[PDB]
Write an enzyme that holds these catalytic residues in place. Structure first.
Site, PDB file in Angstrom:
ATOM      1  N   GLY A   1      11.953   7.024  -1.173  1.00  0.00           N
ATOM      2  CA  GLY A   1      11.770   6.894  -2.597  1.00  0.00           C
ATOM      3  C   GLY A   1      11.405   5.498  -3.064  1.00  0.00           C
ATOM      4  O   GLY A   1      11.124   5.310  -4.253  1.00  0.00           O
TER       5      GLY A   1
ATOM      6  N   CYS B   1       8.671   4.343  -2.228  1.00  0.00           N
ATOM      7  CA  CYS B   1       7.213   4.422  -2.261  1.00  0.00           C
ATOM      8  C   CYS B   1       6.702   4.205  -3.680  1.00  0.00           C
ATOM      9  O   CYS B   1       7.343   4.594  -4.663  1.00  0.00           O
ATOM     10  CB  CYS B   1       6.719   5.768  -1.718  1.00  0.00           C
TER      11      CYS B   1
ATOM     12  N   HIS C   1       0.139  10.672  -1.707  1.00  0.00           N
ATOM     13  CA  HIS C   1       1.011  11.575  -0.971  1.00  0.00           C
ATOM     14  C   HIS C   1       2.238  11.969  -1.754  1.00  0.00           C
ATOM     15  O   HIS C   1       3.150  12.575  -1.184  1.00  0.00           O
ATOM     16  CB  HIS C   1       1.411  10.987   0.384  1.00  0.00           C
TER      17      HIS C   1
END
EC number: 3.4.19.12
Length: 300
Positions: free
Chosen positions: A143, A145, A41
Site C-alpha cells: 500500500g 505504492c 497496476h
C-alpha cells in the site's frame, strides 16, 4: 553546524496525497489540479501481475470503477487515461491545495525526498538518491505504492518519482510522473535484474568537503592525483568515474575549503585503498553518497 541527511518540508505534497481504489486494490494517488496520478497496476489483481495486458484490462474498466478519496470526501471521476505506466483520473474538482509544480525526470546520482504513504495518508518523509542502476533503497510496505518523491525550489514542487514495485532483491522501482520507468523495469511481477550498483563518486567528494567544513579533517592526506589515476582506482572499486563536469560542480566547495578537487581525489583514493581503520567521518563508518554538491551547499 552539524550535518544531517535532511528532507524537504512535506506540507505542500501532503496537501496532495489521495487514496485510489479500483476493484479490490487500493494505493495512493497524486491529486494535482483536476487530475489524479497513480500506478496503473491499481487495476490488477494479484494473479493479474504474473502477466498483465494493460490495454485489455483497462478496457473492462470505466469511470465509476475508480474510487478517489481525499481525506473523508469522495472525488467524482469523469475521465480515465493511461500514459505509459501511470493512470490519470480526470475528476470534477481542482485541488484547492495544488502548489506551483513541475514534472521533472531526474538523472542518476541526484537525490530527492520521498513522502511514504498508506491509504492516502502520509506516515513519513525521508531523503534518498537515485542509484546509478535506477533503483532506490527506500522504505515501502504494501500500500505504499504511488508514494511520490520530489524536490522543492523556493515555492515550486518538482515531482520526480512515483513508486511502483519492489524487486525480489528488496530494492524498489518506479517512474517519473509521465509514467516512464527509471531504468529497465516493467510493471510485471516477474524476476527482474538490477545491474551493478556503483557508488556516486562526486557525491562522496561533496560529503568529504562537508566533513572538512564541520571540522572532520583526519582523512586529508599529503598526496594529490590525476583524474585518470583516480578513475583507475574508482573503477576497481565500483565507483562512478569522475568527469571534468563533476570537477566543475565541486568548484564552490573547493574554493570555500581551500582544498583543490584533485587533492580531495587523492585523499578519497587513499580511503578506498586502506579502509577507515575504525575511524568515522561525520559519525559514519562508511563513505556516504546520498548528498549532492547542491545538497551540501544548501545545508552549509
Amino acid at each position: 553546524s552539524g550535518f544531517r541527511k535532511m528532507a524537504f518540508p512535506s506540507g505542500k505534497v501532503e496537501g496532495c496525497m489521495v487514496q485510489v481504489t479500483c476493484g479490490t486494490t487500493t494505493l495512493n494517488g497524486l491529486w494535482l489540479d483536476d487530475v489524479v496520478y497513480c500506478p496503473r497496476h491499481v487495476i490488477c489483481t494479484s494473479e493479474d501481475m504474473l502477466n498483465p495486458n494493460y490495454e485489455d484490462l483497462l478496457i473492462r474498466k470505466s469511470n465509476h470503477n475508480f474510487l478517489v478519496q481525499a481525506g473523508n470526501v469522495q472525488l467524482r471521476v469523469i475521465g480515465h487515461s493511461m500514459q505509459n505506466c501511470v493512470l490519470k483520473l480526470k475528476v470534477d474538482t481542482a485541488n484547492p491545495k495544488t502548489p506551483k509544480y513541475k514534472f521533472v525526470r531526474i538523472q542518476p546520482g541526484q537525490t530527492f525526498s520521498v513522502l511514504a504513504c498508506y491509504n492516502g495518508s502520509p506516515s513519513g518523509v525521508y531523503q534518498c538518491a537515485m542509484r546509478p542502476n535506477f533503483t532506490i533503497k527506500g522504505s515501502f510496505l504494501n500500500g505504499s505504492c504511488g508514494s511520490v518523491g520530489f524536490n522543492i525550489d523556493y515555492d515550486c514542487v518538482s515531482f520526480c518519482y512515483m513508486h511502483h514495485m519492489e524487486l525480489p532483491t528488496g530494492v524498489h522501482a518506479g517512474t517519473d510522473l509521465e509514467g516512464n520507468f527509471y531504468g529497465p523495469f516493467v510493471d510485471r511481477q516477474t524476476a527482474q535484474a538490477a545491474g551493478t550498483d556503483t557508488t556516486i563518486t562526486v557525491n562522496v567528494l561533496a560529503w568529504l568537503y562537508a566533513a572538512v567544513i564541520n571540522g572532520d579533517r583526519w582523512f586529508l592526506n599529503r598526496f594529490t592525483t590525476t583524474l585518470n589515476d583516480f578513475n583507475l582506482v574508482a573503477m576497481k572499486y565500483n565507483y562512478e568515474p569522475l568527469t571534468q563536469d563533476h570537477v566543475d560542480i565541486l568548484g564552490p566547495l573547493s574554493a570555500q575549503t581551500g582544498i583543490a578537487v584533485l587533492d580531495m581525489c587523492a585523499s578519497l583514493k587513499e580511503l578506498l585503498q586502506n579502509g577507515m581503520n575504525g575511524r568515522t567521518i561525520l559519525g559514519s563508518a562508511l563513505l556516504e553518497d546520498e548528498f549532492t554538491p547542491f545538497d551540501v551547499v544548501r545545508q552549509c
